[PDB]
Structure 1
Amino acid sequence: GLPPGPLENSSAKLVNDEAHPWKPLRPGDIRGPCPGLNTLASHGYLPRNGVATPAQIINAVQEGFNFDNQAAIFLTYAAHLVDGNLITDLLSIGRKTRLTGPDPPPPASVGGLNEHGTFEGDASMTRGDAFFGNNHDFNETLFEQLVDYSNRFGGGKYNLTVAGELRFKRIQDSIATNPNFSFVDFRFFTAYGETTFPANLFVDGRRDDGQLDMDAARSFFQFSRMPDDFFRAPSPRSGTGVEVVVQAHPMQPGRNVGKINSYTVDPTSSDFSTPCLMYEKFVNITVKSLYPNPTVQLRKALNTNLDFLFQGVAAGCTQVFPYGR
């Protein structure tokens, strides 16, 4: 289906309401590395089994959290192109599942949001690096480090100042311990934006003061659960304040080169000075590598989802056509 448009009414409102109660997981229900999508699934804004269409994800992030339309389109179609089934139009918000339907040929993985190095990647705040065995489950030790950083830099709340310090701490922890640490291109961009989302979208919309309390933080990050009486944000937003997080500790894109403490800058990577290059590499290298020579029906589904992705790309970038027009 076509990407949904913006909300007709973007006011703050109760989203933890009678039609969207929290429920625990049933056998087979899928949760993944994103506390936002996990919460929408666990309140029935998404299918509770954690398998959804791109149109369902965009409608859910808008309706439940007031995620802005352009950000919703960009992230949802990027995730879907690399992790979703383009023929069935289904994406797992976590593990690979037969529920997304018959797989395309390799090297396409259709691995769900849990797939390392497509969307998901290293130096997550509350999830471990894939090298350490689990890139998707809530991690109590890492959450307690978020709490400690909130206590030291946020007077006990998570805010953009905390985000700037913890983002850097998590990068330095991956450099020191993950010999395969990768922090380039799409992950370099998304890792900074994600640190703003708790301050912008998990804060009750009646306050909208960017100060997330640790009870609410644990409820979203661990239990995929809105606070009792949670109001969504009072206007559409996604990553506003990311400039504060970058400014705290500016980093160049790079990777460890098969050993700890070997962080080597990659001059072929996009960075914040080359946002259009991030889009071009994502399509020309990442998507094309999964679907190098697609059959007629896949090519058509790729071209449709690539058009939708471009709708979420900031004005002033040129659309690229890896399978022609």
Structure 2
Amino acid sequence: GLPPGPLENSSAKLVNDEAHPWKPLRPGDIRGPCPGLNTLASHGYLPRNGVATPAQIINAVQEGFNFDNQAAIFLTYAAHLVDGNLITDLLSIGRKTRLTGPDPPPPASVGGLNEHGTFEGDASMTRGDAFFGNNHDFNETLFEQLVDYSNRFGGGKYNLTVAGELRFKRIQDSIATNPNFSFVDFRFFTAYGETTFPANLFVDGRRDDGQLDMDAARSFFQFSRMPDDFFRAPSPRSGTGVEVVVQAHPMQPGRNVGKINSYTVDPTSSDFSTPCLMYEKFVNITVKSLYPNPTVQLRKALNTNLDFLFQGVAAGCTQVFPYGR
């Protein structure tokens, strides 16, 4: 189905309402590394089992949180291309599931958002690095570090100053302890934007002050649960203020090279100076690696989802076509 268009009405409104109550997980219900999608599934903005179409995810992030249309399109189709089933049009917001339908041939994993190295990656704020054995569950120690950073840099609240310090701390902990730490291309970009999302989207829209309290923070990050009477943001947004996060501790894209404390800059990586390159490498290297010589139906589905992806790409970039036209 087509990418949904922006909200007709983007006002702050109650999204924790009678039609979208929080429910606990049933057996089979999938939650993953994204507290946003997790919250939308747990309020029934997405199917509660955590398996959804791209169109469902786009409508959910807009309606539930006032995520802006362009960000919603780019992030949803990028995740779907690398983690979703392109024939069934279904994506797991967590673990690999037979509910996404019959798999394509390898090396495509259709591993859901839990799949490491595709969308999900290292130096997450409240989830551990995949090397430490779990890239998706809420982590109490990490969240207590977010609370500590909120006390030290945010006067008890999560804000872009806290994002700046914590983003860097998580990178330096991954450099120190994960010999397989990877911080290049797609992850380098998403890792910065994600640290703004709590300040931009988890703050009650009647305040919209970019100061997230630790009760609300815990309710989203741990329980996938809106605060009682939660109002979504009063206007569409996603990553606004990411510039403050980068400016706090500017980092070059790089990786550990099989050892802790071996962070090596990758000159082949995109950075914030080459945003078009990040899109080109994502489509030409990542997507094409998972589907090197696709069958005619898969090729059609790929081309359709790549067109959709390109709608989410900022103007100034040229569309790349790994399967032709």
Task: Give the TM-score taking structure 1 as reference length.
Answer: 1.00
User: Which SS does the other structure have where 2:117 is aligned?
Assistant: coil
Per-residue deviation, residues 111-155 of structure 1 (Å, max 9, x unmatched): 000000000000000000000000000000000000000000000
2:285 matched residue in structure 1: 285
TM-superposed deviation, 1:247: 0.1
TM-superposed deviation, 1:283: 0.2
**Alpha-carbon distance in 2 for matches of 1:94, 1:197:** 19
Unmatched 5+ stretches in structure 2:
none
2:211 matched residue in structure 1: 211
TM-superposed deviation, 1:72: 0.1
1:321 matched residue in structure 2: 321
**Alpha-carbon distance in 2 for matches of 1:104, 1:78:** 17
1:251 partnered with 2:248 = no
TM-superposed deviation, 1:64: 0.1
TM-superposed deviation, 1:54: 0.1
User: Which SS does the other structure have where 2:283 is aligned?
Assistant: helix
**Alpha-carbon distance in 2 for matches of 1:63, 1:100:** 24
Per-residue deviation, residues 271-302 of structure 1 (Å, max 9, x unmatched): 00000000000000000000000000000000
**Alpha-carbon distance in 1 for matches of 2:241, 2:43:** 27
Per-residue deviation, residues 8-30 of structure 1 (Å, max 9, x unmatched): 00000000000000000000000
User: Which SS does the other structure have where 1:39 is aligned?
Assistant: helix
**Alpha-carbon distance in 1 for matches of 2:19, 2:292:** 43
1:128 partnered with 2:97 = no
Give RMSD over aligned pairs: 0.1
TM-superposed deviation, 1:65: 0.1
**Alpha-carbon distance in 1 for matches of 2:118, 2:29:** 22
Per-residue deviation, residues 202-260 of structure 1 (Å, max 9, x unmatched): 00000000000000000000000000000000000000000000000000000000000
Per-residue deviation, residues 74-116 of structure 1 (Å, max 9, x unmatched): 0000000000000000000000000000000000000000000
**Alpha-carbon distance in 1 for matches of 2:145, 2:23:** 28
**Alpha-carbon distance in 2 for matches of 1:12, 1:145:** 30
**Alpha-carbon distance in 2 for matches of 1:296, 1:166:** 45
**Alpha-carbon distance in 2 for matches of 1:233, 1:23:** 22
Q: Number of residues paired by the alignment?
A: 325
1:202 matched residue in structure 2: 202
**Alpha-carbon distance in 1 for matches of 2:3, 2:156:** 39
Q: Percent identity?
A: 100
**Alpha-carbon distance in 2 for matches of 1:238, 1:198:** 10
User: Which SS does the other structure have where 1:236 is aligned?
Assistant: coil
**Alpha-carbon distance in 2 for matches of 1:158, 1:48:** 28
User: Which SS does the other structure have where 1:74 is aligned?
Assistant: helix
**Alpha-carbon distance in 2 for matches of 1:17, 1:47:** 16
**Alpha-carbon distance in 2 for matches of 1:84, 1:250:** 32
Runs (4+) of structure 1 exceeding 3 A deviation are none
